[PDB]
Structures are given as C-alpha cells and as structure tokens.
C-alpha cells in the first residue's frame, strides 16, 4: 500500500528522466521496476465471471436497442486474427451492412460528462491528450457496474499483443532496428503515465469519487491504453465543427485486410457507416481496411504484423547540413517548395521507394549552384519548384545520377547497421518455433531490411538508367 506509493514515485522519477547507447539499459531498468509493481498487484481490478463470448449476446441486444445493425453477421473466434465478424448471408461489395449510432460510442465528450468529468477539467494531461482521456473513461466505466457501456466493455479482450505485453527476450529481437526506439518510448510513456495518474488519483480532491481510487493497477492502465490504441477512431463532433476520438462498438470487432477505407461518419444521421469492402459470402470473415499504416505502426499501436502490407515503410532522417557551401540557397529552395531543411522521410516497400516530397528534397540536396539559381530566379523558377517532386521532370541527368547514387549508398549503409541479415532472419523463421509476439518482432526486423534492400536495387536501376541518358546525351523532358 504505502509501498506501492513509494514504488510508483520511484517509477515516476525514472520515467521522467530525459532521453539517455543506453536506451536498452534504461528499458530493462524501467521494465524491472514495472514488473516489480505488477507482481505485487492483483492483475485487472475488475474481471468478469463469464467467458468473453458469453457477453456477445448482451452487446448485440444493447446495440440493437440503440439503433445499430445487428443482422447478417455473427462473432467467431478465428485462429489467425482472434475474434471477428463472419457473414451469415451473402454481403455484396459496397453494401451498407453495418451502422453504429453516436449514442453507443465512447468519446472524449462522453468522458467529460462522466464521473471522470471533475478530474478532466482540473488535469492538464487529460485535457491535452484525448487518447489518455479515452483510456480512463474506459477504466472508470469498466469499474462502474451500471455503466451504459458495460455490454461493450465486457466483450473487449482482456490482453493484447502490443509491445507492452512482450517478454524482454521478444523485444530483444528488435535490438538495432528503427522500431525498437518506438517500443522504448511506448514503454516509458506508459510507465510514466501509470505512475503519474496513480499519484493524481490518490490525492486530487476531484478524483475522490472515482472507482479507480479504490483500485488502479498497472495491469489496468496497460489494458486501457492498449484497448484505446488498437481500436480508437477519429470522428467529427456532433456539430461537425471539430474532431474527437471515439471507441465504436460492434464495428470495431472487424479485423483488417488489404484494400480501401469504406467506413465513414454520416453526420446528417449521426452514425458510423460501413460498406462492404468486397463480396462476403455466407461463412466468410468480414474484413475492413484499417488504414495505410506501416507494419511498425501495426505492431506497436495495433498489436499485429500484417503480411503483404503494401503500405509498409521505414523512416529515414535527412537534412541539409549548415556546413554546406550552398546551405542558404538550398534552404531557400526547400522553403519555397514548402519543404523543411531537415526532417524524417520514409522509404516505401512498393515502387517507387520515395515520395514526391523526398524526391524534391534529394534533388535540391544534390543541386549545383547553377541549378539552384534556376530554382530561385526568373519567371520559370516557380514552375521548376512546382515540378520538383515530379519524377518525369528532372532538373538534369547529372542531378538524377547524384541523388540516386546517394540514396543507394545511404540505404546500403542503413542495411549494415542491423544485427542480423535478411538470410539469417529467414532462417530463424524457418527453423525456430516461435510465439506470435516473437514472430511479430522477427518479421518486423526482417521487413525493415527488405524495404531497404528494395530501395538499394531501385536506386541502382535508376542511377544506371540516368547514367545512360547522360551518356547518350539524351534531351530532358520539356
């Protein structure tokens, strides 16, 4: 009791310590503390007597009573994705088959008007971060046995596959990747928030009535933030003025497949509406397309790795150096094109590996002084800036050879900073028997390297292609 207080205070101090070479050691340090607290607590404060599926009939009845679609599908525990919706009749592509009225959602607005409302006005984090407001909304209603939203809360999972639930050795597979630093931040964010709100809830007057004051475990918080990150959605407010974050019951039981977004908010009728992404025959699982997220984002925020994610990408940080003889001119061209002199870009799995904005950056980054002047002076300078991201209008063959040479060298260098090779990773997946979470970790580190390798090959092809145009003295597109 008083020992949990001292433990969380220690946790708050360490997790508020600034960024520290030593990121893995800090992660293991925080982990050791977190696990010490968790092992001294009783797991989830509120648990339900039934199995998860025993509550799906109540969800359907409650949703039906409040105007949601409840016919044409059923809940099924699928091995690959967990629970999901399965069609009980044939559903045709583009059919409006699912709808959920606003009254059923949990939103920041409904959090503010809940028992959490006093604390929400007083606390700066809750007012500034709707995702965290949503998480505590979820916890308070979970502990309120007569909550309007109990039918939804009693059908949520009780654990997730976000990295907050990984073993240390499962995270260890990600050492030397880009992704591990986002795993580190999420762990430290969540530990710091648990410690801070544990203190707040124990002492703040406006929290005295919260059921969390009786019991608020680390398990509770990890559960609530993972529920929110894997399921939250952005929707308009009632008046269409602003956006807010919302949990959307029933429809959020749909699992993910490749495609286009087919879910939208109907403001005139004040409900979420989902049309069929494809034909679903009776007996087929109903999927939606979650969004164009990277596999790092799917693993870290959504808790799964999606094979054949055509939107996969890795980050690359680039910038014009202040030590560049042409820094001022390059900075001005970038500013006129609306591009910063330094930021993080992406390398994409699909061809081409770079976006128009990264192509524009690389062209400027590789420009001679005469080329830069052509982008700053004269009536055509604005037109040149306009086409700076267009692969069909090169500044010059020479500029292209230089930028593609740079990208090939840089992607190759990045590949050399990984602890394992692509072939070693494929051998591990082939010959080791792994947990779901371990396989997520290894497929993520493999995919980072596969994206880089494709960028090396694409850049090599482009460099050679533009070398030939430069040798054949070919004319530039006008």
């Amino acid at each position: 009791p008083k020992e949990i207080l001292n433990l969380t205070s220690e946790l708050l101090q360490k997790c508020s310590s600034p960024a520290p070479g030593k990121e893995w050691e800090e992660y293991v340090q925080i982990r050791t503390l977190v696990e010490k607290i968790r092992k001294k607590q009783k797991g989830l404060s509120v648990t339900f007597d039934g199995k998860r599926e025993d509550y799906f009939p109540d969800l359907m009845k409650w949703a039906s009573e409040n105007g949601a679609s409840v016919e044409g599908f059923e809940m099924v525990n699928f091995k690959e994705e967990g629970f999901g919706l399965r069609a009980t009749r044939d559903i045709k592509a583009e059919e409006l088959f699912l709808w959920v009225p606003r009254k059923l959602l949990m939103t920041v607005e409904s959090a503010k008007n809940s028992v959490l409302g006093p604390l929400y006005s007083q606390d700066r984090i809750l007012q500034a971060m709707g995702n965290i407001a949503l998480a505590f909304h979820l916890l308070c209603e979970r502990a309120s046995p007569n909550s309007f939203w109990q039918p939804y809360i009693q059908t949520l999972p009780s654990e997730y596959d976000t990295p907050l639930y990984f073993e240390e050795d499962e995270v260890r597979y990600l050492q030397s990747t880009q992704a591990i630093h986002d795993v580190f931040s999420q762990y430290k964010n969540t530990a710091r928030q648990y410690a801070y709100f544990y203190k707040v809830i124990q002492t703040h007057p406006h929290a005295n009535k919260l059921p969390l004051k009786d019991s608020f475990t680390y398990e509770d918080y990890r559960w609530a933030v993972s529920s929110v990150m894997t399921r939250q959605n952005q929707i308009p407010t009632e008046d269409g003025s602003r956006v807010t974050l919302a949990l959307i019951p029933l429809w959020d039981m749909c699992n993910h497949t490749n495609g286009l977004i087919t879910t939208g908010y109907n403001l005139e009728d004040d409900r979420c509406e989902c049309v069929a992404l494809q034909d679903f025959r009776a007996g087929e699982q109903i999927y939606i397309f979650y969004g164009t997220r990277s596999n790092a984002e799917f693993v870290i925020h959504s808790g799964f790795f999606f094979d054949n994610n055509s939107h996969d990408r890795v980050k690359i940080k680039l910038g014009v150096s202040k030590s560049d003889r042409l820094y001022a001119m390059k900075a001005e061209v970038l500013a006129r094109a609306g591009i910063p002199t330094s930021s993080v870009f992406a390398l994409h799995f699909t061809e081409p590996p770079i976006s128009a904005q990264l192509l524009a950056f690389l062209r400027v980054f590789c420009m001679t002084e005469e080329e830069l002047k052509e982008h700053l002076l004269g009536d055509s300078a604005i037109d040149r800036i306009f086409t700076l991201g267009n692969s069909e209008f090169p500044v010059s063959w020479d500029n292209e050879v230089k930028l593609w040479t740079f990208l090939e060298d840089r992607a190759s260098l990045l590949l050399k900073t990984y602890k394992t090779t692509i072939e070693e990773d494929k051998s591990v997946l082939k010959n080791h028997d792994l947990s779901v979470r371990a396989k997520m970790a290894i497929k993520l580190r493999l995919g980072e390297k596969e994206i880089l390798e494709k960028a090396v090959k694409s850049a090599a092809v482009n460099r050679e292609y533009y070398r030939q145009q430069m040798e054949e003295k070919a004319p530039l597109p006008k």
Binding site: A128, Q234, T263, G264, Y290, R293
Partner: peptide, 19 residues
C-alpha cells in the same frame, strides 16, 4: 466519402513532448 474513418489511427502518447 464523408469523413473517412481510419480504424486505430496512430495518436501521440508522449505527454512530455506534448506538454
């Protein structure tokens, strides 16, 4: 499409970088 909904949209959980 009126107000497309990206399901599980990525949000910022870093209270220190945001406050």
């Amino acid at each position: 499409l009126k107000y497309p909904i990206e399901h599980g949209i990525v949000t910022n959980w870093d209270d220190m970088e945001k406050i």
